[PDB]
């Protein structure tokens, strides 16, 4: 008896939809019919985008697509961290860092460099102990990651022989990634591409979807439906009546204004990182690419009108407020009660979302798809398959939401009503527990070298954001008081970070030069 | 004012005690005074203990003690698995397997070999699909591990050149491991050994221990106390008054009768595995070493009297009850509500315990030790360090309690009250959750190759036990129906098991011959 899913209908032709078609195309080995229904009429988000390092391994590698192939197609650039600018100090927006009391610029990094360990203790803890004992004033990113010296010099993460120097994620234009995966899906995975608008969702009496009707009159039948229709959530929210859980009491930002600023790569090179530039009522991203950089001011629409934000955004880069090609989007912050209901699976903005502070959005998509491939059902829609998928989404999303909440709740700024309101907010119990662990000087979420998605943000990453913002431990890791040999060892690791950080800038090619050989 | 712990007092000098002293002696880098108070007691028959593969990485390697060096000191032998004999068929115990309704012997293995994967799916899942679809008649352990063929031939997990062939753990007389560690702490880390009986625990107004009185009139001052006093929990249960949570409503067995049996190694060879031989009111371990095997009937004393168990144990091996030297113990099952209270940390039998069906005892020691070192305090005894250590202990203990529940609740024997009463136990929520996941065809706790202690028992292990006992998923993993190529890729994996089983059975030395060379007996 064949009780398999025979047809999969994906509603949506943005990044979520085509990622889904590309990945299920590879995963279901031409046993299922895959249809993408997408309205050219209804724009897709596409704003210039950044990612995290597992993208290549957990997605493109699955598709059999080498990095340098996809990268060359979407004008892709290298990302080694998020660099935070003017998060600690008061004032209006500026690209340039204000000065701290110690005379350092108000900047701190969030690299993806893995912290070295000595005696089963990561370097961060050795660094925190010397700090709290008055034996060093040096900053955490400068002391613990060579990457920092590479980024400040704007050098690349690869040599010209393409030998890897450091860990890195990607910047790219979303549209181009969408377009690349659309061609891939259609011409290599044989996905049917339907260009039209859905007008009606047909369900049966048990509340399962049977087809989507299009304005042209075609009826697209299917056994499984994936909702990549964006924030409107036309299947999961509208048709299935799954409620969205609003979480504007955990993160306040709900709006953005973006554009693509052109840029002189011969003069200033290219920064190999995403900058996140604090503002009075939020922050602004900057995503360097060959010839241009994407940017956008994320803000709360309770603390600023579309005007003020557009104006502050425009001031930042010296843009004309009245004749610029702006991109205004209001966004959901939260997750659906249940991500997958009956025979509808939400993926993308139809599912969960947080502001783009740590580049969560594309990660969420390929993690949800992977979760769906693993729990892929037949027509009986086993309750346990659906519920384990849903528990996995739930955990992945709360992990990230708390890590983001950590960026705002510990910030010292109190100059504007936005920043003050970010301290009135209640922290989820799980983040408070981790803060407690941290304050006791213990590690939070030690790395383990699938289940990455459950605990994606490691000790290294909590230290960048806590110690960067100035949240320190109450005291040093107590065990270190008994470990004079391990402390000496860690002095060698600290030297090793400086000697490597010195050696690589002298030998490494600039980011621009590396993007020259890669691209046109 | 220096806030560090200057003196650590360990009560007890069995395995828990001397592992604690040696590990702390390395971890605290001679900045702390370590004192072991323990009573001489007496010397007893070594009924043998079995272990799991991390013992060397997580403990002996930390101390810089090479495998061969410590094995040579405790007549150790190799363990590639636990082998379950007659857990599916009724009747009195026999070392020899009974024959199942389908013609197979009633034996199944729990190896330590990690499973291979095709398309991010464990080979177990390919086996279960074929099995539920009628495409293989083969057992899980035969299908998915070459260790099964190596064990059936009694071949060693290493070659004579000492090159590794399989994953394994150890068999040994733990009294000797304790004596070897005692020597190492005393000669190489200047531990203070006080051979005396503790008679009083002194405490201050806030409930903290300040010193231990001995019979001879010592008052041993300390800042941190480790309770390694055994089941008595003299510090954590008596002095600190921390309740033990009895958990005999999750696992029934609470007793053991054990002896060491001389063995003809030139005749029978040496099994590289621990055997679990099902009995009417329990089960009996067989833990081979060179020259003898340790053995012991674990039982519930609600369902059997000591004399009954002891007689059934003897009959199993053809022993003369009156001419055999037995050790007899009644053990508690559970954990202390908090393993660490104030300045008293409990380790070993003083802390938590479960029957030794899957070799949890020494594991619980070095795991808790490791957790103590990670959360090692000063004299402020920050309540977050104490609470996180306790969190880890109970998560470690529940993982293992869950795993052991799976062994009994899914046994299809109904022939005696003991076996029936196993099926009227309440499963914990988390083991029930795993069963559901398994029953839906999904993986259970997928492997990821520190934090191993959270999630130690992985998908392979849950399949060895579930499938061994007869609990199958209700239907294959559904994704597999859509993956004709992955299925074919797993067929090659199945073939690599068979071939590697053929080669290693031909090329490996007998476990006997390897032991002879390692212990220098030939
Ligand atoms: C301001 C901002 C900034 C970022 C991000 C979001 C936001 C709001 N993200 C998230 C990321 O952009 C997002 O995950 C995808 O790129 C686009 O999401 P979707 O495909 O789900 O919806 P999207 O809205 O993009 O597409 C919806 C699709 O559904 C179709 N549709 C809707 N209604 C229809 C109907 N009735 N009939 C037919 N079709 C219909 C649309 O036409 C379209 O094809 C992100 N992530 C990241 O990793 N790093 C980053 O830097 C950012 N940056
Ligand atoms: C039946 C059975 C079978 C097994 C196991 C246990 C049991 C009960 N174990 C567990 C393992 O054998 C055990 O945990 C350790 O070997 C010994 O643990 P302790 O040191 O905590 O107790 P243990 O009882 O050995 O030591 C207590 C110490 O405290 C001392 N003491 C008590 N009161 C005192 C006082 N007032 N003053 C001074 N000193 C005092 C004692 O004298 C002794 O030195 C096991 N594990 C495993 O990993 N695999 C296996 O196969 C088995 N098998």
From Swiss-Prot, chain B:
The record's statement on gene disruption is: Deletion mutant cannot produce thienodolin. Thienodolin production is restored when the mutant is cultured in the presence of 6-chloro-tryptophan.
Keyword entries, A-Z: FAD, Flavoprotein, Nucleotide-binding, Oxidoreductase
Q: Does the keyword Nucleotide-binding apply?
A: yes
Q: Which residues form the active site?
A: 79
Domain of life, per lineage:
Bacteria
User: Which residues of this protein are annotated with the site description Important for activity?
Assistant: 358
Q: What result is annotated for mutating residue 82 to I?
A: In Thal-RebH5; regioselectivity of chlorination and bromination is almost completely switched from C6 to C7
Quote the catalytic activity from the record: L-tryptophan + FADH2 + chloride + O2 = 6-chloro-L-tryptophan + FAD + 2 H2O; D-tryptophan + FADH2 + chloride + O2 = 6-chloro-D-tryptophan + FAD + 2 H2O
Which InterPro entries does the entry mention?
FAD/NAD-bd_sf, Flavin-dep_Halogenase_NPB, Flavin_halogenase, Trp_halogen
Q: Does the record carry Thylakoid as a key word?
A: no
Where, in this chain's numbering, is L-tryptophan bound?
111, 452, 456
Any idea which positions bind FAD?
Answer: 13, 15-16, 39, 42, 45, 47, 50, 198, 349, 362
Please tell me where chloride binds in this chain. 360-361
Give the EC number(s) listed in the UniProt record.
1.14.19.59
**One Pfam match, by short name?**
Trp_halogenase
State one molecular function term (GO): monooxygenase activity
Summarize the protein's role: Involved in the biosynthesis of thienodolin, a plant growth-regulating compound. Catalyzes the chlorination of tryptophan (Trp) at C6 position to yield 6-chloro-tryptophan. It is also able to use bromide ions to generate monobrominated Trp. In vitro, accepts a wide range of amides and peptides carrying either L- or D-Trp at the N-terminus.
State the PANTHER family in the record.
FAD-BINDING PROTEIN, FLAVIN-DEPENDENT TRYPTOPHAN HALOGENASE
Assembly mode: Homodimer. Monomer in solution.
Its UniProt miscellaneous note says: The reaction between FADH(2), Cl(-) and O(2) produces hypochlorous acid (HOCl), a powerful oxidant. Unlike the mechanism previously proposed for the tryptophan 7-halogenase RebH (AC Q8KHZ8), which suggests the formation of a chloramine intermediate with a conserved lysine, Phintha et al. propose that the conserved lysine likely protonates HOCl during the halogenation reaction.
Regarding protein family, the annotation reads: Belongs to the flavin-dependent halogenase family. Bacterial tryptophan halogenase subfamily.
**Domain-related comment:** Binding of tryptophan induces structural changes. Binding of substrate to the halogenase reduces the affinity for the oxidized cofactor FAD presumably to facilitate the regeneration of FADH(2) by flavin reductases.
Name the record gives this protein:
Tryptophan 6-halogenase ThaL
Q: Quick one: which gene encodes this? A: thaL
């Amino acid at each position: 008896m064949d009780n398999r899913i025979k047809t999969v209908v994906i509603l949506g032709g943005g990044t979520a939809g085509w990622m889904t078609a590309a990945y299920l195309g590879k995963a279901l080995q031409n046993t299922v019919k895959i249809v993408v229904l997408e309205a050219p009429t209804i724009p897709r988000i596409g704003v210039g985008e950044a990612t995290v390092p597992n993208l290549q391994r957990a997605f493109f590698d699955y598709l059999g697509i080498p990095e340098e192939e996809w990268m060359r197609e979407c004008n892709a650039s290298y990302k080694m961290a998020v660099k935070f600018i003017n998060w600690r100090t008061p004032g209006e927006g500026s690209p340039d860092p204000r000065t701290l009391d110690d005379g350092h610029t108000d900047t701190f990094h969030h690299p993806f460099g893995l912290l070295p360990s000595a005696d089963q203790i990561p370097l961060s803890h050795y660094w925190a102990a010397k700090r709290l004992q008055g034996e060093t004033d040096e900053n955490f990113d400068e002391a613990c990651f060579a990457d920092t010296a590479i980024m400040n010099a704007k050098k690349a993460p690869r040599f010209l022989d393409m030998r890897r120097a450091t860990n890195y994620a990607w910047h790219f234009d979303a549209s181009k990634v969408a377009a690349f995966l659309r061609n891939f899906a259609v011409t290599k995975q044989a996905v049917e591409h339907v260009e039209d608008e859905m007008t009606e969702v047909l369900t049966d009496e048990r509340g399962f979807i049977t087809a989507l009707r299009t304005k042209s009159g075609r009826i697209l039948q299917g056994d499984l439906f994936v909702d990549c229709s964006g924030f409107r959530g036309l299947l999961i929210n509208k048709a299935m009546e799954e409620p969205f859980i609003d979480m504007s009491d955990h993160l306040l930002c709900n709006s953005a204004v973006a554009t693509a600023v052109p840029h002189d790569d011969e003069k200033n090179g290219v920064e190999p990182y995403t900058s996140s530039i604090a503002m009075e009522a939020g922050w602004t991203w900057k995503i360097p690419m060959l010839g241009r950089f994407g940017s956008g001011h994320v803000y709360s629409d309770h603390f600023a009108t579309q005007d003020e934000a557009t104006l502050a955004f425009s001031k930042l880069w010296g843009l004309d407020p009245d004749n610029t090609e702006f991109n205004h989007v209001r966004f959901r912050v939260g997750r659906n009660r249940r991500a997958w209901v009956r025979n509808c699976v939400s993926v993308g903005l139809a599912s969960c979302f947080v502001e783009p502070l740590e580049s969560s959005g594309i990660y969420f998509i390929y993690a949800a798809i992977h979760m769906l491939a693993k729990h892929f059902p037949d027509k009986t829609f086993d309750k346990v398959l659906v519920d384990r998928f849903n528990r996995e989404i739930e955990e992945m999303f709360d992990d990230t939401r708390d890590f983001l909440q950590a960026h705002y709740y510990f910030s010292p700024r109190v100059d504007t009503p936005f920043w003050r309101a970010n301290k009135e907010l209640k922290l989820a119990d799980s983040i408070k527990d981790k803060v407690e662990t941290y304050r006791a000087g213990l590690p939070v979420n030690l790395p383990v070298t699938e289940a990455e998605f459950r605990n994606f943000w490691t000790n290294g990453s909590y230290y960048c954001i806590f110690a960067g913002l100035g949240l320190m431990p109450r005291n040093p890791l107590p065990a270190l008081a008994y470990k004079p040999q391990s402390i000496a060892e860690a002095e060698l690791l600290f030297a090793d970070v400086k000697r490597k950080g010195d050696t690589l800038v002298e030998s490494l090619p600039s980011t621009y030069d590396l993007l020259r050989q890669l691209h046109g």
